[PDB]
Amino acid sequence: KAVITLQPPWVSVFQEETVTLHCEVLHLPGSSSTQWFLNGTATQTSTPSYRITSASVNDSGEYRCQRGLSGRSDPIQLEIHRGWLLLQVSSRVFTEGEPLALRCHAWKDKLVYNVLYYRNGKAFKFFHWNSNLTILKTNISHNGTYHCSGMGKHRYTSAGISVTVKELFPAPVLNASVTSPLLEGNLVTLSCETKLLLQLYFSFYMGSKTLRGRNTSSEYQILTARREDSGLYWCEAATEDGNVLKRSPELELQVLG
Ligand SMILES: *[C@@H]1O[C@H](CO[C@@H]2O[C@@H](C)[C@@H](O)[C@@H](O)[C@@H]2O)[C@@H](O[C@@H]2O[C@H](CO)[C@@H](O[C@H]3O[C@H](CO)[C@@H](O)[C@H](O)[C@@H]3O)[C@H](O)[C@H]2NC(C)=O)[C@H](O)[C@H]1NC(C)=O
Ligand SMILES: *[C@@H]1O[C@H](CO)[C@@H](O[C@@H]2O[C@H](CO)[C@@H](O[C@H]3O[C@H](CO)[C@@H](O)[C@H](O)[C@@H]3O)[C@H](O)[C@H]2NC(C)=O)[C@H](O)[C@H]1NC(C)=O
Ligand SMILES: *[C@@H]1O[C@H](CO)[C@@H](O[C@@H]2O[C@H](CO)[C@@H](O)[C@H](O)[C@H]2NC(C)=O)[C@H](O)[C@H]1NC(C)=O
Numbered sequence: 001k002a003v004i005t006l007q008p009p010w011v012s013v014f015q016e017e018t019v020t021l022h023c024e025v026l027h028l029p030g031s032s033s034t035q036w037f038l039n040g041t042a043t044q045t046s047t048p049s050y051r052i053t054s055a056s057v058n059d060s061g062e063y064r065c066q067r068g069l070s071g072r073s074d075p076i077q078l079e080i081h082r083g084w085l086l087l088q089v090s091s092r093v094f095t096e097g098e099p100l101a102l103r104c105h106a107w108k109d110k111l112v113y114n115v116l117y118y119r120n121g122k123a124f125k126f127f128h129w130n131s132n133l134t135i136l137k138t139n140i141s142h143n144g145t146y147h148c149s150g151m152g153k154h155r156y157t158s159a160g161i162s163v164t165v166k167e168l169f170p171a172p173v174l175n176a177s178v179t180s181p182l183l184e185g186n187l188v189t190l191s192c193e194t195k196l197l198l199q200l201y202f203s204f205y206m207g208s209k210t211l212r213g214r215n216t217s218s219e220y221q222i223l224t225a226r227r228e229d230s231g232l233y234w235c236e237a238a239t240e241d242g243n244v245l246k247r248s249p250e251l252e253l254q255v256l257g
């Protein structure tokens with residue numbers, strides 16, 4: 001079960017640039033007997049590192065690898081360009097929570113100022129002096145085609161790249177076993193409704209008060225509903241790690257008695 005890594009991380013590169021593809025398996029091998037594939041066709045390279053000294057149009061395509069131990073790696077698309085500006089991306093398809101590095105790369109490392117970053121045609125970031133954009137933690141709003149524009153001898157634009165940010169679980173919805181306003185003494189079940197679209201830790205809250213902390217149970221019961229229980233209720237759904245947690249819209253419960 002191999003995996004491809006790039007020395008300069010960028011999946012999109014200019015013509016005449018250096019990019020090295022390394023086939024590495026954590027189940028350790030094996031070593032060197034390597035099997036590199038370009039557009040579903042095996043290449044003459046056996047070295048664990050597929051080095052491209054000066055990139056050209058035919059070096060573009062889908063890459064796959066095999067290292068000693070059986071298990072063909074996930075396919076990675078590498079694209080070589082010509083032009084003035086290039087929006088460089090570290091990955092094309094990834095799950096939310098994973099960081100995303102963006103780079104507005106200029107031809108022959110020329111100096112560019114008044115740099116803009118676009119997501120689906122709309123500019124979202126300005127940099128006076130060219131700088132990299134690293135989104136520490138991604139979500140579904142980061143999905144889409146990215147571009148960059150900057151000022152050199154003239155205002156140049158880069159070609160666009162589609163980035164796919166895959167959603168794990170949708171933002172949760174707090175559902176109550178009874179409708180609001182409810183009568184005092186009622187037994188209420190609070191359920192943090194979400195579906196993993198493929199371990200989840202849930203927590204229940206009331207305004208600022210913590211009702212129940214991190215646990216696998218998607219349910220919480222208000223044993224005997226009192227007037228003091230009237231307020232805004234919301235839940236939080238998160239991965240074991242914690243990396244990713246989503247809050248739910250506030251659900252008001254009015255208790256009458
Ligand atoms: C954006 O990031 C580029 C890549 O950096 C790596 O990835 C980032 C996401 C981040 O994790 C960072 O910490 C990593 O190192 C940066 O490019 C690096 O810096 C140079 C610019 O291309 C380059 O080098 C040069 O500098 C010497 C002088 O010291 C010159 O002689 C030479 O010609 C180069 O100009 C180096 O190859 C590169 N490093 C890697 C690992 O790719 C860069 O800071 C930044 N780019 C911009 C445009 O702001
Ligand atoms: C692996 O598949 C790649 C993608 O299909 C292929 O690259 C593509 O190749 C052609 C020709 O080299 C390019 O298409 C045409 O448009 C350009 C405009 O820049 C002109 O130079 C020519 O008219 C040209 O025929 C594609 O742009 C190019 N890249 C992509 C990303 O589609 C590779 O050649 C294949 N590599 C191997 C080793 O089989
Ligand atoms: C970002 O949003 C969606 C994912 O939430 C992207 O993909 C959609 O679904 C499939 C699978 O990737 C593709 O066939 C389509 O491109 C998208 N749906 C439709 C109905 O077209 C999507 O590519 C991203 N960006 C945009 C601008 O749609």
Ligand SMILES: *[C@@H]1O[C@H](CO)[C@@H](O[C@H]2O[C@H](CO)[C@@H](O)[C@H](O)[C@@H]2O)[C@H](O)[C@H]1NC(C)=O
Binds near residue numbers: 137138140141142
């Ligand atoms: C996707 O995550 C980003 C953060 O990575 C959220 O952006 C917040 O930060 C912006 C500017 O950086 C600030 O103006 C607002 O607070 C943004 O909301 C973004 O909201 C988020 N979207 C979803 C749907 O989760």
Ligand SMILES: *[C@@H]1O[C@H](CO)[C@@H](O)[C@H](O)[C@H]1NC(C)=O
Binds near residue numbers: 058
């Ligand atoms: C790239 O591939 C195309 C189509 O197979 C061919 O016409 C062309 O000569 C190749 N160019 C280089 C630089 O190898």
Ligand SMILES: *[C@@H]1O[C@H](CO)[C@@H](O)[C@H](O)[C@H]1NC(C)=O
Binds near residue numbers: 175176177178179
């Ligand atoms: C809670 O969700 C279940 C399943 O979708 C549904 O039967 C029920 O009506 C929901 N509760 C309310 C108060 O709508």
